[PDB]
């Protein structure tokens, strides 16, 4: 999978090791090899949640399979847990969009995964 988090938390509040932690925990959660996991953290964003600029995050998780009802509830628990612990963002100020990608619609290494 590919995990993107946009947040109004400042860059200096993103701890050392965060990208590696996300990579490792997504590998653990999805069972997928870390060598194909991509993570992207975008701090200092101009955003509001419910009209408030208290800490919040808008995230997305794209996966070729491993997306579904129970899996997504599990990912949300995991990922909100990590954002709360490491970036001090309340889980009720986080949205995560999940996308099940067709392999033919993911390009990589001059081709696609089809």
């Amino acid at each position: 999978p590919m995990f993107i988090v946009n947040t109004n938390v400042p860059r200096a509040s993103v701890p050392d090791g965060f990208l590696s932690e996300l990579t490792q925990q997504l590998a653990q959660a999805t069972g997928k090899p870390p060598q194909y996991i991509a993570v992207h953290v975008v701090p200092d964003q101009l955003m509001a949640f419910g009209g408030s600029s208290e800490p919040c995050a808008l995230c997305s998780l794209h996966s070729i399979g491993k997306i579904g009802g129970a899996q997504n509830r599990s990912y949300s628990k995991l990922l909100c847990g990590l954002l709360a612990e490491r970036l001090r963002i309340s889980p009720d100020r986080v949205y995560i969009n999940y996308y099940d990608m067709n392999a033919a619609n993911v390009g990589w290494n001059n081709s696609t995964f089809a």
Copy 2:
């Protein structure tokens, strides 16, 4: 719903109060309490629209339902109108991608909306 704007307009040209105006106007247009609305504005972007670096915007609106032909036209008039008035972006230099999200594919507060 969640509304994201990426634009080459500089930060200093985003007016004070713009995130609140977007929240209010989206709540009114969708008939939803502002507590459910998230907004995100990303200025100073390196982008081109039709080969031109004149002011432009690439946006997205994600909603669990309430997406379709007529509603999307109405959102586009509202949102292009706001971007023209507040950021001085011509409506024909705006793209808005509309996404009808399944509740099971939106995470919030350690779970999903399913």
Copy 3:
């Protein structure tokens, strides 16, 4: 169509003609007039691919049709080629997500493309 590239490559390493080159190459490759093509490059990103912070890129291509198996493979060879030549990113550290948008789900000019 709309092409977005997020990358950890620094802003200074993006050649000055890069947006125009993307616009022209995508117009050639998609058979669309360049007036319809939007391009967006986001450097200096905090991202990792396979746990590594070597240069990498996470991209997307949105089109109303002109998306599918062989077409996406051709787009990936073209776009990986440009990212390797111009930004010095290895093709095996690039993801490109392809999205076939319905015309009624793309807003533009106060309406949609429906």
